[PDB]
Amino acid sequence: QDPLSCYDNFGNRDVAACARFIDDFCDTLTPNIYRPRDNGQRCYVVNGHKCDFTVFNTNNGGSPIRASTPNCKTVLRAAANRCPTGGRGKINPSAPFLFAIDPNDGDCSTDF
Amino acid sequence: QDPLSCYDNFGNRDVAACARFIDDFCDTLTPNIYRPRDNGQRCYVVNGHKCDFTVFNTNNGGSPIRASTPNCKTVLRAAANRCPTGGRGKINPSAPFLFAIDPNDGDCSTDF
Numbered sequence A, B: 001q002d003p004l005s006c007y008d009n010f011g012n013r014d015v016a017a018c019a020r021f022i023d024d025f026c027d028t029l030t031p032n033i034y035r036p037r038d039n040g041q042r043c044y045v046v047n048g049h050k051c052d053f054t055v056f057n058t059n060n061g062g063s064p065i066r067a068s069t070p071n072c073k074t075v076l077r078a079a080a081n082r083c084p085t086g087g088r089g090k091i092n093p094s095a096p097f098l099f100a101i102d103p104n105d106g107d108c109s110t111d112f
Helices: A015-029 A069-082 B019-029 B069-082
Strands: A004-006 A039-046 A049-057 A087-089 A097-104 B004-006 B039-046 B049-057 B087-089 B097-105
Touching (some): B019 B039, B019 B049
Antiparallel strands (some): A004 A087, A039 B039, B049 B097
16 A cells, blocks of 8 residues: 555545445456556445445556456555545555545436 | 437537447446445546446345346447437346446546
């Protein structure tokens, strides 16, 4: 977990309710192959709000690649333990994938 | 493909550039088990815009379930063929999953 950055302190929702979904998100979305600058996401409903998870290939070019399941868990657990309103990061500075865990208002039915 | 509804969103791009991702999206995200009211999404870069795909469990309750891979493809191909700016639908009005294909401006790095 380096870099590891927290979202700001203005959010209304706590990340602790989202930690329960880290394993499911990492297990299901990391085996996919992602093109450079593409992402995969999942949305989970909890406590009248939602938890938005992202895996993002930060590479600008090169081959489409799959992500690391254990690295996803290490990063997102660190974010959940260190960032009360959620956060994002990579396993190490050179790693291609960024992972994010984001508690948000709303639900998983909107914007499509 | 009923309902099958085209988007009206101002400035949407042409869905034709996004059709290439239908099989990848459906193959990768439909086998996951989704709780009622949860979703999975992918964002794909193309032609300086992006393509936002969604699979959404419309059920309010009941056991968490995976989605149909062929139905995902049938619905999204119908959207790509009938809706120049993309759209959304289900295989039939009672089916649990809604699938969407949304060609629109931006990139896959926003909001996380």
